[PDB]
C-alpha cells in the first residue's frame, strides 16, 4: 500500500551505493597506479650516490617533504569521512519487517 | 628516499578504500534483497480489500508511516556522508610528481 515513501528513500539509497562503489573501484585502480609509479621513482632517487646530492636537491627534498604532510592531511580528511560511511537503520528496517509480516498474517497472506 | 612517510600514507589510504569498496558491495547485495522483499510485501498488502481493512490496520499502517519517516532521516544522513566522499589532493600528487622528475632528470635517471 502507497502508505508511505519508503520504497523510492531505500531505491535512492541503494543507487548512490551503486555509485559510490564504482567510484571506489576507480579511486582504487587510480590510486593503485600512482601509488606504485611514485614509490618506483623513489626507489631510483634513493640509490643516487650522496656525493651527487647538492644544494638544489636539498630544496626538492624539503619541498617535497612539505608537500607529503599536506598530502598527509588531505588524506586524514578522506580517512576520517570513510569512518562515518549503521544499528539504527537495523532494527528499524527489522521492525518494519515485523510489522508487514502481521498485516500480511492478518490477511491471509503467505 | 626516505624523506617522508609519504607512501605509508597512501597506502594507508588505498587499504581503506580497498576496505570501503568491499563493505559498499555488500551494503548493495543486502540492501537490493532488503527492498525486494520489502516491495513484494507492499505490493500484495496492496491487494487486500478496503472493506477488510479495521482498526487494527490502521494502528499498523500508521506505525508503517512513522517508522518509514525516521529511516527517511537515517538514510538522509548516509546520503550526506556520501556527499563528502578531489581537487586539492590531485594537484598536490601532481606537483609531488613534477618535483620526482626533476631530480630523476637532475641525476640522470630515466
Given at each position: 500500500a502507497a502508505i508511505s515513501n519508503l520504497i523510492p528513500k531505500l531505491g535512492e539509497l541503494l543507487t548512490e551505493e551503486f555509485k559510490?562503489?564504482?567510484?571506489?573501484?576507480k579511486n582504487?585502480?587510480?590510486?593503485?597506479?600512482?601509488l606504485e609509479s611514485m614509490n618506483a621513482a623513489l626507489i631510483k632517487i634513493?640509490?643516487?650516490?650522496r656525493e651527487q646530492l647538492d644544494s638544489q636537491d636539498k630544496l626538492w627534498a624539503d619541498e617535497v617533504r612539505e608537500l607529503s604532510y599536506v598530502i598527509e592531511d588531505v588524506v586524514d580528511k578522506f580517512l576520517v569521512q570513510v569512518d562515518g560511511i549503521n544499528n539504527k537503520f537495523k532494527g528499524l528496517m527489522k521492525r518494519?519487517?515485523?510489522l508487514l509480516k502481521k498485516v500480511k498474517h492478518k490477511h491471509?497472506?503467505?
Open positions: 559510490l562503489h564504482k567510484g571506489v573501484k582504487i585502480e587510480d590510486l593503485g597506479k600512482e634513493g640509490e643516487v650516490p518494519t519487517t515485523e491471509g497472506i503467505a
